[PDB]
Symmetry: none
Subunit: 101 residues, 4 copies
């Protein structure tokens, strides 16, 4: 996983389609495309990240007061935690060669 702006170059937009040449995990580069048309929208003059259908991501829909739709809706925040795993658990030296066991 890498940040678009930091690990890709020669980016281009044609219509709603984004193309860029990005670093591969284990070296070298790949050029690929993504259609932004379904993930970005125009809300009141502003580009924003398209949300989700409320029937998929909100529960307990109800009327509130005389005119409000109320619900409990899932967030989509991106949280990272620092983590480690000891490769000595399963990674061995078999006659000079790393192997999983």
């Amino acid at each position: 996983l890498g940040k678009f702006s930091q690990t890709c170059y020669n980016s281009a937009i044609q219509g709603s389609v984004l193309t860029s040449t990005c670093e591969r995990t284990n070296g070298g580069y790949n050029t690929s495309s993504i259609d932004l048309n379904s993930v970005i929208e125009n809300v009141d003059g502003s580009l924003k990240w398209q949300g989700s259908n409320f029937i998929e991501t909100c529960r307990n829909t109800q009327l509130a007061g005389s005119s409000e739709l109320a619900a409990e809706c899932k967030t989509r925040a991106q949280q990272f935690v620092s983590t480690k795993i000891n490769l000595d658990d399963h990674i061995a030296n078999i006659d000079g060669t790393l192997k999983y066991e």
Copy 2:
């Protein structure tokens, strides 16, 4: 715009559907329903009004700087607003391939 509640009564929400009994222009009442599923969305845990396809309603879509997408988008009131979105928010490089995350 809107304001149905001013001339309706017995509104209810079931599922994604609003039902209400509303005054006819010349008098008397009519009960009707509307499915709110295509006009309201969940954006980051909040119910918001669904926006428009940005290719259809924005012009001059272009990459700007290292990671930004810029466009001039139409408001609901027929005006243009110059807007930027940071593609780094949700466009990731996964092993050399652009993927939304």
Copy 3:
């Protein structure tokens, strides 16, 4: 959005495949199936929810000390937030019939 156990019935599992008859959002029922094999795994004799590929969901992979793989990995916990939207914004009474404007 409904909880499987609360809004479905006549559920069965055959092999890795879950079948059930579930409430539709706006009334009635539907029977569908889901293959649990790609989302559940056996970890040391316990069924657990399968995780994600660490290259898709973790960044900054590095070796820590002599034998540890270290990274910053995304969580998959999202809260539910109580939200409301005023349907009077865009829902109107047009001669006895609810319409979006």
Copy 4:
């Protein structure tokens, strides 16, 4: 199991790939690489050792009560143990269709 770090040196991780220089059984050293992407996963923000396919390594899969998948799964000691998982955790009813969320 494992313990590569005891007889190896100049270890490094790049992307998902561990590289190390390891002692050969009959003396001398060899540098090799192992891709960790298929044996480690991100589970809830923690790096963990990947488990096995439950259909291949468990037996007697069935639904228990209204929401639980029950099985007997093989342990690293090669015996079967009783295990359950609450399908409510991630199996949702979306408008009548079972969907992982």
